[PDB]
């Protein structure tokens, strides 16, 4: 790990200090994190991939279609990248690795990205492309953590699909494809068609296992809330704060988790 000493030490130290500094309100915190990232602008690629996911979210918000510009402005500039409808999705595909896969999944542009169920598939494809961009970091321990998080997201997507999207008529093969290395293969959770039966198989996934536990909130929920406890655990994975590695994406995730905790606290 002498490469950190040879070069890139100052940027890594600044990123580590920004991470350790952080332990409406959520929007303000996200904007502050974006401003810190812009001031800062290896670990840089990981931070870029995290911003690519946060921009896939804003692009899916923008690819659809209502004060959309105001909604994007309310979002963080890291989430709402300044560089950035079929034309809207195509323009989003440029400068954002995550967007083109979302456009491919959304064959009907906004119509195939309806917020009810179709936008879930579009955002899943966007997250798959963002995970490909993260894998473009040529591997690593942070890449392993990202793969585990992507597997958790895929398991949550498959569990939510089996729970509710069967009524949405998302094909089981397509839903498994919609639910995304580790995220790619989740046949154990897709084996069980029944929602109650599939919930146990999804919890059997190692990312969901040992984290959800009772999972009164979590695996029962739809969308991508099945691995909510695993997300907090992955945040606690960054709590190790091992130096000489690339953890800028971990810093951004920790800042986002702090913002989410502040939002959940809200008044008192």
């Amino acid at each position: 790990a002498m490469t950190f000493n040879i070069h890139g030490g100052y940027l890594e130290a600044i990123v580590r200090g920004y991470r350790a500094g952080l332990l409406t309100i959520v929007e303000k915190c996200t904007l502050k994190l974006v401003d810190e990232y812009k001031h800062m602008l290896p670990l840089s690629t990981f931070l870029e991939y995290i911003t690519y996911g946060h921009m896939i979210d804003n692009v899916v918000l923008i690819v659809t279609g209502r004060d959309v510009q105001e909604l994007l402005e309310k979002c963080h500039p890291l989430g709402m990248f300044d560089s950035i409808m079929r034309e809207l999705y195509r323009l989003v595909l440029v400068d954002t690795p995550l967007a083109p896969y979302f456009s491919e999944c959304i064959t009907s542009e906004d119509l195939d990205d309806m917020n009810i169920e179709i936008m879930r598939n579009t955002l899943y494809k966007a997250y798959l492309e963002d995970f490909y961009k993260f894998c473009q970091k040529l591997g690593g321990a942070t890449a392993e953590i990202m793969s585990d998080l992507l597997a958790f997201e895929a398991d949550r997507r498959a569990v939510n699909i089996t729970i509710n999207s069967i009524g949405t008529e998302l094909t089981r093969d397509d839903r498994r494809k919609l639910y995304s290395l580790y995220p790619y293969g989740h046949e154990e959770l897709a084996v069980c068609e029944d929602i109650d039966q599939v919930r146990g198989v999804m919890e059997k996934y190692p990312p969901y296992q040992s984290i959800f536990s009772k999972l009164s909130y979590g695996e029962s929920q739809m969308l991508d809330k099945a691995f909510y406890e695993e997300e907090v655990k992955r945040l606690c994975l960054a709590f190790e704060q091992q130096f000489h590695y690339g953890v800028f994406f971990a810093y951004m995730r920790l800042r986002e988790q702090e913002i989410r905790n502040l939002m959940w606290i809200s008044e008192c």
Binding site: A1, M2, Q242, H244
Partner: peptide, 16 residues
């Protein structure tokens, strides 16, 4: 001595 340096680098984070 390089292993010693690695041990010290880890020791910094440990003593943090």
């Amino acid at each position: 001595a390089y292993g010693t340096a690695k041990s010290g680098v880890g020791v910094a984070s440990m003593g943090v």
